Amino acid sequence: LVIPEKFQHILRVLNTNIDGRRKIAFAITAIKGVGRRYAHVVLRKADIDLTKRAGELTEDEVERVITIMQNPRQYKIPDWFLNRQKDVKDGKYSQVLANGLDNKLREDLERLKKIRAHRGLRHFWGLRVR
Amino acid sequence: FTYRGVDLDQLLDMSYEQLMQLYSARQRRRLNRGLRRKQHSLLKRLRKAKKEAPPMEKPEVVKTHLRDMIILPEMVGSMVGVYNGKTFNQVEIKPEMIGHYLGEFSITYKPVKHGRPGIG
């Protein structure tokens, strides 16, 4: 392979630093809320060859990967694959991202304290739930 | 307040079989299996205690040993005491907690605070 001049050593995506020297799938996996399965399927849906590295990508490809990652369902990602299927509040099939996981984990925890369920009080003392 | 994008009023006026799409798998399986006579008797007891109340006052407390109740949207506003093996715990039925069982609102054990260990 040859030396690409337009190589980004570090990517700055979604309040997250991404190691650009890594493979594309596992660099997308490096953020919260995206594992290897989700990164592989969103990269297959983006019509991008999986053999490339993360830094030597053009900006339009990066922004369309982010676009498909943000809104999965109307880009033909099926509604059994997403992280949050039925939210308690709005009930929308939504795949949440790095700030989204932490925000919605906190809101689920605080509504469980408001409910005063056994799980919420167990989380409050800080013991095993399962 | 909203529950799967559905507000409480159209939760109450909705018929029974559209609630068989809006719960989790466990609650749908239970309510599809059919509720026991004790569930239905407590249901009449709770609706009787709710109708026989002053408008500004909360309903009278209904005490029960039932811990496998699934909170339907009909019991929001009920004043219910649940037995946990030793003592009743009295609770308001809030609408954000319909998708849960009653028995998890009365914990049946004490949190462990460790003392100084003995000889061993």
């Binding site: - | 407390v61 946990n84 715990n89 009295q90 609770v91 004490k110």
Partner: peptide, 14 residues
């Protein structure tokens, strides 16, 4: 700081 209807069995939980 104890809720209105809870018992001591669960007041030690809070």
């Amino acid at each position: 700081k104890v809720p209105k209807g809870t018992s001591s069995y669960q007041a030690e939980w809070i």
